[PDB]
Design a protein around this ligand. Structure first.
Ligand SMILES: COc1ccc([C@@H]2CNC(=O)C2)cc1OC1CCCC1
Ligand SMILES: COc1ccc([C@@H]2CNC(=O)C2)cc1OC1CCCC1
Ligand SMILES: [Mg+2]
Ligand SMILES: [Mg+2]
Ligand SMILES: [Zn+2]
Ligand SMILES: [Zn+2]
Ligand SMILES: [Zn+2]
Lengths: 414, 411
C-alpha cells in the first residue's frame, strides 16, 4: 500500500538524519521532523489510508487494461467490461417592491409569501431564473417552468412549521445571492448555477417535519427503504427529479444528454451535502480550500477542476441552508419560532409514540435563547467564518450581522 | 488550520533548512498519492473530536447545557425436517453432508428441494450453527421468512436467482468456519453475515446498476444512482421481516437488532462491484498489519477490523464461482453469460448500445473468464488466502487450475 511505504521512506530519513548556531538549527529541525512524523500517523483514519491504497490499485489496473484493450477485439471486450464494473392588483405591487431586493441578502421572504398567495418558492424561483436569464439560456418555456415550480411547491408540506416552501424559497434566494459574490465571477458555468439553484429549491421537498433520527427510530418506510442513511436527503432528491416526469414539467428537456447527466450528478452531490451529519466533512473541505486558495487579479477566486468547484458549491448550499442566524433579527427571530414549533410537533409525535422525548422537542423543557447561542457558537459561526475567509472581503457584513444576533440571543437568556 | 497542511507547513520548513533523496521521494509521494477525500477525512476527524470535547463540557453546565449539547451532538456529528417439502429427501440429505464443505453441489440441493435451495441451505446452516436456539427463532418464523425471501428471487433471471443466493450463503457459512478465524466473531456477527449473504441479491432484475441508471429506471431515480441494486436488495430483505410470522429478529434486544441492521447494511452495500478496489485495499492493509494469536487464530480487535473482514468475506463469497470445482464453475459461467445475453436483449429493445459481454456473437467466454480471474478473482482470493494462511490454499489451487483450463479453451 502507498502510506505504509511512504511512512517507511520518511522513517528511514529520521534514522539517517541523526547519522553552536548550527546546533540550534540542527536540534530545532530534528524535533520538528519528529513532530510531523507523529502528526502524520495520528491524524490518520481507516478510510484516509485506504483511499490512497484503493486509488493506487485503481490506477495500476487501468494501466494493465489500457494495454490489454490494444491486444485483440476480445482483450478490448474484457477491458471494457472490467473497467466499467470494478472501477468507479395591490399584492402584485408590494410583491414587486419586495422583489427589488432579490439580489440583496436582506430580502423579506415572509412578505414575498404574503404578496404571492403563499407561493414564495414559485415567486422567488421565477424571479431568480428571469434575473439570471436561465429560461432563455437553457430553452425553458415559462409554461413548463411554472408547471414544475408549482408541483414542486405543492409537495412542500403546508402543515410543517419550518421545512415548508418558505424555507426552500429562503435557501433558493440565499444561494442566488451567494452566487453573486464578486469573489466568484466567471468561476461557475451556467449549468453549475442552474444545478445550484435547482438543488436549493428541491433540497427539502416532501419534508415530513421530523428528523432522520426520528424516522430511523420509528422504523419508518422511508428509513427502511433508504437503509437509514441520509433518509430525507435521498427522499428530497427522489421527489425533485421524479416531479420532472409530470405533464409538461420537464425543465431540463432541452439540455443535451451530457448536460443532463452532469447536472443530475451535481444536484445529487449538493442535496446529499445538506445532511447535517455531513457538516464537519463540508467544513473540513472548505477550510482546506481557503488554505490553498489562489486568487486571480482584482480579487476573483481561481478554482480549477470540477472537484474544487463542487466543494465550494455544496458548501454554498449548506451555508445557505444555515443562513437564518446571519439574516436581520426581524427575519432570524421568525425562523427561530418556526424551527421550535416544528421541533415541538416532533416531540408531540414522540409523546404519543411513547418514545423518550428528543433533545429540544418538549415546549415544556425547551431553552431556545441559550440554544441559538450554542447553535451559532459551535456550528453557524465556524461555517460562516470559514466562508467569509474564502470570499474575503465580501460577506464581512453577513458575519457582523451574525455576531450581533448571537449577542442579542445571549442577552435574552433568563 | 487543517492537519495535512499543518504537517507540510513544518515538513517544508524542515527541507528548506536541512539543505535527502528518500525525503525528496516521499516529499513528492506524500502529495501525489494524496487524493481529494483522503486529505478531507484527516481534517473532518480533527473538527468532530474538537467539538465533542466542547459539548462534553457544556453538558456538565446546566440541564439546558445538556439539552443543547445532546441536540448538537446528535445533529452535526455522525453515528419440515429439512425446511423444504421433499419425497426425494434422502438424496437431499446426502448432498447436505457437504454443508461445511466448499465442494457442496448447490445444483443438486436445488434438484432435491423442488427448486428451493435457499430455504434448504439456510435451514441447514441455521441448524448446524444452532442459531435458531441461540437467537430464539421458532422454526415456523424461519421457514416463513425463508420462503418469502426465496419467492422474491426472480425465477426468470438466469444467474441472480435463489440458487446464486444459496451459493453465497453456503460459501459464507464455509468461510466463517476458517480455522484462522475461531473465537473472532460473535454469534450476532455470524447471524449478520449469513443473513447478509442470503438477502445480498433479493429481487435482482437481471440487469446492472449501470443499465438501470442509463434506462432512467424508477429504482435508479429513487436511489439517486448510487448502489441502486444493493440498496434495493437491503430494502426488500428488511421489509420482508414485516410479513405475518416472518420476523426472524423479533426475539433480539433493541441493541442486538440495531447492531445487526448496521452490519447487514454494511455488508450488502459492500457487494457493489464498484466498491471492489476499496474492499481489496482494506483487506491488503489488514494482511500487512495482521496479528495472530497462538496456534494460528487471527487477532481482530475493534469492530472496524472485524467488519472489514466480514464485508470482504461476503464479497469473496459472491466472487467464489471460479474457486469452485470446474463441474460447478462451468455451470456458473453459462448462467452468468445467459443473464448477460438477456441484459443485451433488453438493451436491443431499448435501442441502446449493446453492453460489452452482452452479445453471443461478440462474447469471448473463455478469454473473459481468464481476464476476470487474472484481474479481479485471483488478486482478491490471493489476498484473502494470505490473511487466513495456510487455510484457503485449496481454494487458490482450484482457482489457479480453472484459470489454466479456461486459458486452454481460448480458440
Ligand atoms: C433558527 O434556528 C434554526 C434554523 C435552522 C436549523 C436547522 C434545521 N434543523 C436543524 O437541525 C438545523 C436549526 C435551527 O436552530 C436549532 C438550534 C436548536 C433548535 C434548532
Ligand atoms: C462465472 O463468471 C462470473 C460469475 C460471476 C460474476 C459476477 C456477477 N456479475 C458480475 O459482473 C461479477 C461474473 C462472472 O464473469 C464475468 C467475466 C465474464 C463475464 C462476467
Ligand atoms: Mg435538507
Ligand atoms: Mg449485489
Ligand atoms: Zn433545509
Ligand atoms: Zn403463521
Ligand atoms: Zn451476488
Amino acid at each position: 500500500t502507498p502510506f505504509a511505504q511512504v511512512l517507511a521512506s520518511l522513517r528511514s530519513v529520521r534514522n539517517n538524519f541523526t547519522i553552536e548556531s548550527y546546533q540550534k538549527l540542527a536540534m530545532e529541525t530534528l524535533e520538528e521532523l519528529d513532530w510531523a512524523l507523529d502528526q502524520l500517523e495520528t491524524i490518520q483514519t481507516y478510510r484516509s489510508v485506504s483511499e490512497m491504497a484503493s486509488n493506487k490499485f485503481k490506477r495500476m489496473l487501468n494501466r494493465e487494461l489500457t494495454h490489454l484493450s490494444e491486444m485483440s477485439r476480445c482483450g478490448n471486450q474484457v477491458s471494457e467490461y472490467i473497467s466499467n464494473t470494478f472501477l468507479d392588483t395591490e399584492n402584485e405591487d408590494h410583491l414587486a417592491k419586495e422583489l427589488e431586493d432579490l439580489n440583496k441578502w436582506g430580502l423579506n421572504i415572509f412578505n414575498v409569501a404574503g404578496y404571492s398567495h403563499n407561493r414564495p418558492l414559485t415567486a422567488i424561483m421565477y424571479a431568480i431564473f428571469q434575473e439570471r436569464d436561465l429560461l432563455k439560456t437553457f430553452r425553458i418555456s415559462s409554461d413548463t417552468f411554472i408547471t414544475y415550480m408549482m408541483t414542486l411547491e405543492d409537495h412542500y408540506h403546508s402543515d410543517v412549521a419550518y421545512h415548508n416552501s418558505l424555507h426552500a424559497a429562503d435557501v433558493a434566494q440565499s444561494t442566488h445571492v451567494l452566487l453573486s459574490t464578486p469573489a466568484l465571477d466567471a468561476v461557475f458555468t451556467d449549468l453549475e448555477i442552474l444545478a445550484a439553484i435547482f438543488a436549493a429549491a428541491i433540497h427539502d421537498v416532501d419534508h415530513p417535519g421530523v428528523s432522520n433520527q426520528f424516522l430511523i427510530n420509528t422504523n419508518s418506510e422511508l428509513a427502511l427503504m433508504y437503509n437509514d442513511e441520509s433518509v430525507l436527503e435521498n427522499h428530497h432528491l427522489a421527489v425533485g427529479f421524479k416531479l420532472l416526469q409530470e405533464e409538461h414539467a420537464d425543465i431540463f428537456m432541452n439540455l443535451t444528454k451530457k448536460q443532463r447527466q452532469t447536472l443530475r450528478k451535481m444536484v445529487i452531490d449538493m442535496v446529499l451535502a445538506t445532511d447535517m451529519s455531513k457538516h464537519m466533512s463540508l467544513l473540513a473541505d472548505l477550510k482546506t480550500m481557503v488554505e490553498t486558495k489562489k486568487v486571480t487579479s482584482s480579487g476573483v477566486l481561481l478554482l480549477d477542476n470540477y472537484t474544487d468547484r463542487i466543494q465550494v458549491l455544496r458548501n454554498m448550499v449548506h451555508a445557505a441552508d444555515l443562513s437564518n442566524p446571519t439574516k436581520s433579527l426581524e427575519l432570524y427571530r421568525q425562523w427561530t419560532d418556526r424551527i421550535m414549533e416544528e421541533f415541538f410537533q416532533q416531540g408531540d409525535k414522540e409523546r404519543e409514540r411513547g418514545m423518550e422525548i428528543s433533545p429540544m422537542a418538549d415546549k415544556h423543557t425547551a431553552c431556545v435563547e441559550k440554544s441559538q447561542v450554542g447553535f451559532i457558537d459551535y456550528i453557524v459561526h465556524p461555517l460562516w467564518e470559514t466562508w467569509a475567509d474564502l470570499v474575503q472581503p465580501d460577506a464581512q457584513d453577513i458575519l457582523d450581522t451574525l455576531e450581533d444576533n448571537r449577542n442579542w440571543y445571549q442577552a435574552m437568556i433568563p
